Amino acid sequence: SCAYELIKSLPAKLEQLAQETQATIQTLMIADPNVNKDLRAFCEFLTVQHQRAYRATNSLLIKPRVAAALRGE
Amino acid sequence: CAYELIKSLPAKLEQLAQETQATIQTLMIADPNVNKDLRAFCEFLTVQHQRAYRATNSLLIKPRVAAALRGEE
């Protein structure tokens, strides 16, 4: 294929993971207040993780020479 | 089964890093400036899975948390 599309699709892949685990963590019946707090904090870690990636890939792919190189142009 | 899903996160991110860093290297780019940018992105990708690595392991080592994420044991 091409490297441009691999990298550009990276943020959505991380977003998918974040939702999978958040959704699954939600199907839990946890009574412990601290465990709930830990998992909540981990869930926010995954959201932040996605946004850093989104920002990093966005800043990368606007560089015309970079996009051209990744497209085999 | 939420325990395995969380436990496998860092490894999935490492796969993404590896695949990207690899297909990038299959591109023989000359512009040293573009290559510096891409190397900065690969660095970002390896630091990315190391953060997930620390996060997941820091969470799963807590007994109350592991027990909860498993079938409660």
UniProtKB/Swiss-Prot annotation, chain A:
GO terms for cellular component: host cell mitochondrion. One of its GO terms (biological process) is symbiont-mediated suppression of host innate immune response. The keyword Nucleus does not apply. Residues 1-73 are annotated as: RNA-binding. Coiled coil: none annotated. One of its GO terms (molecular function) is RNA binding. Keywords: Host mitochondrion, Host-virus interaction, Inhibition of host innate immune response by virus, RNA-binding, Suppressor of RNA silencing, Viral immunoevasion. It is found in: Host mitochondrion. The dsRNA-binding region is required for suppression of RNA silencing. The N-terminus is involved in homodimerization. The alpha2 helices of the dimer bind parallel to the stem of the dsRNA helix. Belongs to the nodaviridae B2 protein family. Binds double-strand RNA (dsRNA) with high affinity. Suppresses the host RNA silencing-based antiviral response. Homodimer. Interacts with RNA-directed RNA polymerase. Encoded on a subgenomic RNA (RNA3) synthesized during replication and which is co-terminal with RNA1. This is Protein B2. The lineage of its organism: Viruses, Riboviria, Orthornavirae, Kitrinoviricota, Magsaviricetes.
